[PDB]
């Protein structure tokens, strides 16, 4: 049965850790997968989650199966983070949320639901986007069409070309938007651009699918949700695939959420019973540990207060490294004004390096970056910054 | 988009906890989902896992993303449990295992892999089987055909009818076998029947898919794997979907495994890179907590020694309740010799009650059982045994 199965190619992001950990060189720098690092080059487990895990240890009684949709406390806390404390969607009982294994898991549950219970065929994703977006929707049977987004010349969002691209998108199609910290470009719409985009989705009848993996990493928790909230007010139906991997540093515990909203309570509950059936035919119900850590923190005033200070420390540290990368590329002799990456937000810098420059950087200098030129700024420290900028100027 | 989505029906097993927890009656007994209960009617978190969780608390440094296939220690310990300490499959590097979200998650990863990378169309599952078997394979696009298994008259495995059913199964088809504690009947093949079955699979060219959710619940850890090991010796290729929910009492942490075996090392590694790609397009990589608890225990002599004593205590307690159910149905006046359930193993008793008797039991007496007549013996205690048998004799 397996004699003719040819090998899958390596994953552009996850396949980099395989290679990096097989590299023997005593100075190699990682920069590939989007994981935060502190000043010492360690990815620590946050204090707020270590204390929540203590609590869980001494206060859990059972490991008995959670419902298909997970912990309800989790689900209420998520909706309030996404839509606002005292939103109309929460009060009209218009939103239903299931707990999933991370944002990828939330994106697949969404694709399965839509493939089985809706008339969609096309999903529209930005050029460029996270690589694994194509892969998840195609697994469900859905085709993936592309919309323009970045202007590589001016290092801006080409908004007139995005508008124009999306005029080939029909009523009934899904348009995937990133809520904040666009992966890979780092360029987000302004509130004004998000409002234009919202009225145009209503007018043309597109179903918004928001990918929201970086809440808290651009300006702050509530600010980062302005785009989504501008849409939620205009729209009867939308789905958001949220993740807590990043902003809670809970990467390997797999905690995320798939929130479904419809016109009213009766409809969203009908729709959600099908999303529950799609979940049962995949994994059966969700992993409890990471998700009850999120819920313990969000519920406790003290533990929440320690967490959004740990999250603003992470965002501020990346902010300093983005400046330090631009300053040190200048004193190392790069002839290219790299000042545009300071305007990008999130964990990454989309440097504009070519696939060959990226490839020469791992093979000669041992610094690992994604083949699109995406580099992880949150992986940069003051100690690896000069060997790093020295490697990039030599390849330019 | 969602106006015409009609409601999915409730899950026969998981939908029972929704109903039970909405029942107001002060004497209702659960008996539906396969979760162990101790003498006090509590599902406790085991001591061996509570100590492993302590360890994890004080010794983890990061929550950084695990590889697509999970913890390798976990993967080596699983293969040794399944195939034996010093098996040829382990030494010829013929087996590859990925960590999944429970046995359901392992079964879906298997269905996706097979749908995308193989020529299969049909999967053969026993009559009767776990309900959710149909649902998982159909999600991947595969059809599910049925093979005879139980003789409801004599309360035995109708082996000549199973053999005969499976003669309509073609070369290249998948036949799903339960490794031990058949869900729902409780009737397993003898070693001799498993050997006959193994030589016949080789002869007819079927791909074995073993479902192995109950290791340790029939006779013991190694004994329960005799059927699988009889097949593994005869076969070049097979896949086993294992779970640790039951035997570790880690139900809601979602820990299981999908093991792929092929003729040689080169082939199984080629095949496994496609199974890794199917996993990345679903959730991205697996939840760490439950799986590193399994791995901490299996690795430590003391913690492993406390665990297989906690597991033999669970199996022995169910054994006593199976006798106590048969004895108390007799002194409560049931005219039906219910002695056949003593020969069934695992957590359940397939009582032979009709769908109407089952339905009358929740609506008048508040005892909850699956609509096939499957009752959970491990949910029975000496304190709920008489109200329970009183309810069943009144419905007969
Ligand atoms: C980091 C990241 C992820 C990873 O999600 P998990 O929660 O599954 O780890 C997912 N998406 C969709 C994006 C855009 C992203 O940057
Ligand atoms: C209890 C049980 C399960 C549940 O598996 P999880 O590990 O996903 O909880 C799965 N199967 C396949 C069977 C047969 C079973 O009894």
Short mmCIF file of N, CA, C and O in Angstrom, two decimals, chain B residues 15-92:
data_model
loop_
_atom_site.label_atom_id
_atom_site.label_comp_id
_atom_site.label_asym_id
_atom_site.label_seq_id
_atom_site.Cartn_x
_atom_site.Cartn_y
_atom_site.Cartn_z
N UNK B 15 -23.65 13.19 23.83
CA UNK B 15 -24.91 13.88 24.05
C UNK B 15 -25.67 13.44 25.32
O UNK B 15 -26.60 14.13 25.76
N UNK B 16 -25.28 12.30 25.92
CA UNK B 16 -25.89 11.82 27.15
C UNK B 16 -25.46 12.60 28.36
O UNK B 16 -26.26 12.76 29.28
N UNK B 17 -24.22 13.10 28.39
CA UNK B 17 -23.79 13.91 29.51
C UNK B 17 -24.54 15.23 29.50
O UNK B 17 -24.85 15.73 30.57
N UNK B 18 -24.93 15.79 28.35
CA UNK B 18 -25.70 17.03 28.25
C UNK B 18 -27.07 16.93 28.92
O UNK B 18 -27.53 17.83 29.63
N UNK B 19 -27.70 15.78 28.67
CA UNK B 19 -29.01 15.43 29.19
C UNK B 19 -29.02 15.08 30.66
O UNK B 19 -29.94 15.45 31.40
N UNK B 20 -28.00 14.34 31.09
CA UNK B 20 -27.85 13.89 32.45
C UNK B 20 -27.64 15.11 33.32
O UNK B 20 -28.28 15.24 34.37
N UNK B 21 -26.82 16.06 32.87
CA UNK B 21 -26.54 17.27 33.63
C UNK B 21 -27.61 18.34 33.50
O UNK B 21 -27.49 19.44 34.05
N UNK B 22 -28.67 18.02 32.78
CA UNK B 22 -29.83 18.87 32.71
C UNK B 22 -30.99 18.20 33.46
O UNK B 22 -32.08 18.76 33.58
N UNK B 23 -30.79 16.96 33.96
CA UNK B 23 -31.79 16.25 34.75
C UNK B 23 -31.68 16.68 36.22
O UNK B 23 -30.62 16.69 36.84
N UNK B 24 -32.85 17.05 36.73
CA UNK B 24 -33.05 17.61 38.06
C UNK B 24 -33.30 16.58 39.15
O UNK B 24 -33.30 16.94 40.33
N UNK B 25 -33.54 15.33 38.77
CA UNK B 25 -33.90 14.28 39.71
C UNK B 25 -32.79 13.91 40.70
O UNK B 25 -31.67 13.70 40.26
N UNK B 26 -33.03 13.80 42.01
CA UNK B 26 -32.01 13.55 43.02
C UNK B 26 -31.67 12.08 43.26
O UNK B 26 -31.62 11.60 44.40
N UNK B 27 -31.43 11.34 42.19
CA UNK B 27 -31.08 9.94 42.28
C UNK B 27 -30.65 9.37 40.94
O UNK B 27 -30.47 8.15 40.82
N UNK B 28 -30.48 10.23 39.92
CA UNK B 28 -30.12 9.80 38.59
C UNK B 28 -28.73 9.17 38.49
O UNK B 28 -27.80 9.64 39.14
N UNK B 29 -28.58 8.08 37.72
CA UNK B 29 -27.32 7.33 37.66
C UNK B 29 -26.75 7.41 36.25
O UNK B 29 -27.50 7.12 35.31
N UNK B 30 -25.45 7.77 36.05
CA UNK B 30 -24.93 7.99 34.71
C UNK B 30 -24.64 6.77 33.84
O UNK B 30 -25.23 6.85 32.77
N UNK B 31 -23.83 5.71 34.02
CA UNK B 31 -23.81 4.58 33.02
C UNK B 31 -23.71 4.74 31.47
O UNK B 31 -23.73 3.74 30.74
N UNK B 32 -23.52 5.95 30.92
CA UNK B 32 -23.42 6.19 29.49
C UNK B 32 -21.99 6.21 28.93
O UNK B 32 -21.57 5.20 28.36
N UNK B 33 -21.24 7.31 29.07
CA UNK B 33 -19.88 7.42 28.53
C UNK B 33 -18.88 6.55 29.29
O UNK B 33 -18.99 6.38 30.50
N UNK B 34 -17.90 5.96 28.61
CA UNK B 34 -16.91 5.07 29.18
C UNK B 34 -15.76 5.78 29.89
O UNK B 34 -14.66 6.02 29.37
N UNK B 35 -16.10 6.10 31.13
CA UNK B 35 -15.23 6.73 32.10
C UNK B 35 -15.29 5.84 33.36
O UNK B 35 -16.36 5.38 33.76
N UNK B 36 -14.15 5.51 33.96
CA UNK B 36 -14.07 4.76 35.20
C UNK B 36 -14.56 5.58 36.39
O UNK B 36 -14.37 6.80 36.46
N UNK B 37 -15.19 4.88 37.34
CA UNK B 37 -15.55 5.49 38.63
C UNK B 37 -15.01 4.61 39.73
O UNK B 37 -14.89 3.39 39.54
N UNK B 38 -14.61 5.19 40.86
CA UNK B 38 -14.17 4.39 41.98
C UNK B 38 -15.36 4.08 42.87
O UNK B 38 -16.46 4.51 42.57
N UNK B 39 -15.14 3.43 44.01
CA UNK B 39 -16.20 2.99 44.92
C UNK B 39 -17.08 4.10 45.48
O UNK B 39 -18.22 3.87 45.90
N UNK B 40 -16.58 5.33 45.40
CA UNK B 40 -17.33 6.47 45.91
C UNK B 40 -18.09 7.20 44.82
O UNK B 40 -18.77 8.20 45.08
N UNK B 41 -17.97 6.75 43.57
CA UNK B 41 -18.67 7.37 42.45
C UNK B 41 -17.98 8.58 41.84
O UNK B 41 -18.58 9.36 41.09
N UNK B 42 -16.69 8.74 42.15
CA UNK B 42 -15.86 9.82 41.65
C UNK B 42 -14.91 9.28 40.59
O UNK B 42 -14.53 8.11 40.63
N UNK B 43 -14.58 10.11 39.60
CA UNK B 43 -13.55 9.75 38.63
C UNK B 43 -12.31 10.51 39.10
O UNK B 43 -12.18 11.70 38.83
N UNK B 44 -11.38 9.94 39.84
CA UNK B 44 -10.25 10.68 40.33
C UNK B 44 -9.10 10.80 39.32
O UNK B 44 -8.97 10.02 38.35
N UNK B 45 -8.30 11.85 39.51
CA UNK B 45 -7.07 11.91 38.77
C UNK B 45 -6.09 11.05 39.56
O UNK B 45 -5.89 11.24 40.76
N UNK B 46 -5.55 10.01 38.89
CA UNK B 46 -4.60 9.04 39.44
C UNK B 46 -3.44 9.65 40.19
O UNK B 46 -3.02 10.76 39.86
N UNK B 47 -2.89 8.94 41.17
CA UNK B 47 -1.79 9.43 41.98
C UNK B 47 -0.50 9.51 41.15
O UNK B 47 0.28 10.48 41.29
N UNK B 48 -0.33 8.54 40.23
CA UNK B 48 0.87 8.49 39.44
C UNK B 48 0.91 9.68 38.50
O UNK B 48 1.98 10.21 38.24
N UNK B 49 -0.24 10.17 38.03
CA UNK B 49 -0.19 11.31 37.13
C UNK B 49 -0.09 12.60 37.95
O UNK B 49 0.57 13.53 37.51
N UNK B 50 -0.63 12.66 39.17
CA UNK B 50 -0.59 13.85 40.01
C UNK B 50 0.84 14.14 40.42
O UNK B 50 1.25 15.29 40.47
N UNK B 51 1.62 13.07 40.66
CA UNK B 51 3.03 13.19 40.98
C UNK B 51 3.85 13.58 39.75
O UNK B 51 4.79 14.38 39.84
N UNK B 52 3.48 13.09 38.56
CA UNK B 52 4.18 13.43 37.32
C UNK B 52 3.95 14.91 37.01
O UNK B 52 4.89 15.61 36.66
N UNK B 53 2.72 15.39 37.25
CA UNK B 53 2.33 16.77 37.03
C UNK B 53 3.09 17.68 37.97
O UNK B 53 3.43 18.79 37.56
N UNK B 54 3.36 17.23 39.22
CA UNK B 54 4.19 17.94 40.19
C UNK B 54 5.57 18.13 39.59
O UNK B 54 6.07 19.24 39.59
N UNK B 55 6.13 17.04 39.04
CA UNK B 55 7.46 17.02 38.48
C UNK B 55 7.55 18.07 37.37
O UNK B 55 8.42 18.93 37.36
N UNK B 56 6.57 18.04 36.47
CA UNK B 56 6.51 18.91 35.33
C UNK B 56 6.49 20.35 35.73
O UNK B 56 7.18 21.16 35.13
N UNK B 57 5.74 20.63 36.80
CA UNK B 57 5.61 21.97 37.33
C UNK B 57 6.97 22.54 37.71
O UNK B 57 7.33 23.63 37.28
N UNK B 58 7.77 21.76 38.43
CA UNK B 58 9.04 22.22 38.93
C UNK B 58 10.17 22.02 37.95
O UNK B 58 11.22 22.66 38.13
N UNK B 59 10.00 21.20 36.92
CA UNK B 59 11.11 20.98 36.02
C UNK B 59 10.97 21.50 34.58
O UNK B 59 11.99 21.51 33.90
N UNK B 60 9.81 21.99 34.10
CA UNK B 60 9.67 22.59 32.78
C UNK B 60 10.22 24.00 32.77
O UNK B 60 10.09 24.72 33.77
N UNK B 61 10.79 24.35 31.60
CA UNK B 61 11.48 25.62 31.31
C UNK B 61 10.78 26.44 30.24
O UNK B 61 10.81 27.66 30.28
N UNK B 62 10.15 25.74 29.29
CA UNK B 62 9.51 26.34 28.14
C UNK B 62 8.23 25.64 27.77
O UNK B 62 7.98 24.49 28.15
N UNK B 63 7.38 26.39 27.07
CA UNK B 63 6.19 25.81 26.46
C UNK B 63 6.40 25.87 24.94
O UNK B 63 5.46 25.79 24.16
N UNK B 64 7.61 26.03 24.43
CA UNK B 64 7.91 26.10 22.99
C UNK B 64 7.45 24.85 22.21
O UNK B 64 7.52 23.72 22.70
N UNK B 65 6.90 25.11 21.03
CA UNK B 65 6.35 24.13 20.11
C UNK B 65 7.17 22.88 19.97
O UNK B 65 8.38 22.89 19.75
N UNK B 66 6.40 21.82 20.17
CA UNK B 66 6.83 20.45 19.98
C UNK B 66 6.91 20.18 18.47
O UNK B 66 6.31 20.91 17.68
N UNK B 67 7.61 19.15 18.01
CA UNK B 67 7.62 18.79 16.61
C UNK B 67 6.26 18.27 16.20
O UNK B 67 5.44 17.93 17.06
N UNK B 68 6.01 18.19 14.89
CA UNK B 68 4.72 17.76 14.37
C UNK B 68 4.26 16.45 14.92
O UNK B 68 3.10 16.30 15.26
N UNK B 69 5.21 15.55 15.09
CA UNK B 69 4.96 14.21 15.63
C UNK B 69 5.03 14.06 17.16
O UNK B 69 4.88 12.96 17.69
N UNK B 70 5.26 15.16 17.89
CA UNK B 70 5.25 15.13 19.34
C UNK B 70 6.56 14.71 19.99
O UNK B 70 7.61 14.74 19.36
N UNK B 71 6.48 14.30 21.27
CA UNK B 71 7.62 13.94 22.10
C UNK B 71 8.17 12.60 21.66
O UNK B 71 7.40 11.66 21.63
N UNK B 72 9.45 12.44 21.29
CA UNK B 72 10.00 11.17 20.88
C UNK B 72 10.06 10.12 21.99
O UNK B 72 9.91 8.94 21.70
N UNK B 73 10.24 10.52 23.25
CA UNK B 73 10.28 9.58 24.36
C UNK B 73 8.94 8.85 24.39
O UNK B 73 8.88 7.63 24.49
N UNK B 74 7.87 9.61 24.25
CA UNK B 74 6.50 9.13 24.19
C UNK B 74 6.34 8.07 23.10
O UNK B 74 5.88 6.95 23.33
N UNK B 75 6.77 8.44 21.89
CA UNK B 75 6.77 7.57 20.71
C UNK B 75 7.53 6.27 20.90
O UNK B 75 6.99 5.23 20.49
N UNK B 76 8.73 6.25 21.55
CA UNK B 76 9.48 5.02 21.79
C UNK B 76 8.76 4.16 22.82
O UNK B 76 8.60 2.98 22.58
N UNK B 77 8.31 4.74 23.94
CA UNK B 77 7.58 4.04 25.01
C UNK B 77 6.27 3.39 24.53
O UNK B 77 5.92 2.27 24.94
N UNK B 78 5.56 4.06 23.60
CA UNK B 78 4.32 3.57 23.02
C UNK B 78 4.63 2.31 22.21
O UNK B 78 4.06 1.27 22.50
N UNK B 79 5.58 2.37 21.26
CA UNK B 79 5.94 1.23 20.41
C UNK B 79 6.34 -0.02 21.18
O UNK B 79 6.05 -1.13 20.75
N UNK B 80 7.03 0.16 22.31
CA UNK B 80 7.41 -0.92 23.19
C UNK B 80 6.20 -1.51 23.92
O UNK B 80 6.21 -2.69 24.26
N UNK B 81 5.17 -0.69 24.20
CA UNK B 81 3.98 -1.16 24.87
C UNK B 81 3.17 -1.98 23.91
O UNK B 81 2.60 -3.01 24.29
N UNK B 82 3.10 -1.48 22.67
CA UNK B 82 2.30 -2.10 21.63
C UNK B 82 2.95 -3.36 21.09
O UNK B 82 2.28 -4.37 21.00
N UNK B 83 4.25 -3.33 20.74
CA UNK B 83 4.87 -4.45 20.04
C UNK B 83 5.77 -5.35 20.90
O UNK B 83 6.02 -6.50 20.56
N UNK B 84 6.22 -4.89 22.06
CA UNK B 84 7.06 -5.67 22.93
C UNK B 84 8.46 -5.11 22.99
O UNK B 84 9.00 -4.54 22.03
N UNK B 85 8.99 -5.25 24.21
CA UNK B 85 10.35 -4.89 24.52
C UNK B 85 11.25 -5.84 23.71
O UNK B 85 11.22 -7.06 23.90
N UNK B 86 11.94 -5.24 22.74
CA UNK B 86 12.87 -5.94 21.86
C UNK B 86 12.24 -6.60 20.64
O UNK B 86 12.66 -7.65 20.18
N UNK B 87 11.21 -5.97 20.10
CA UNK B 87 10.52 -6.46 18.92
C UNK B 87 11.36 -6.17 17.69
O UNK B 87 12.16 -5.23 17.67
N UNK B 88 11.11 -6.96 16.64
CA UNK B 88 11.77 -6.78 15.36
C UNK B 88 11.38 -5.48 14.66
O UNK B 88 12.21 -4.92 13.95
N UNK B 89 10.16 -4.98 14.87
CA UNK B 89 9.69 -3.75 14.24
C UNK B 89 10.43 -2.57 14.78
O UNK B 89 10.64 -1.60 14.05
N UNK B 90 10.82 -2.64 16.05
CA UNK B 90 11.52 -1.54 16.68
C UNK B 90 13.00 -1.54 16.29
O UNK B 90 13.63 -0.49 16.09
N UNK B 91 13.54 -2.75 16.17
CA UNK B 91 14.95 -2.91 15.83
C UNK B 91 15.26 -2.76 14.33
O UNK B 91 16.34 -2.31 13.96
N UNK B 92 14.32 -3.05 13.43
CA UNK B 92 14.53 -2.81 12.02
C UNK B 92 14.12 -1.41 11.58
O UNK B 92 14.15 -1.10 10.38
#
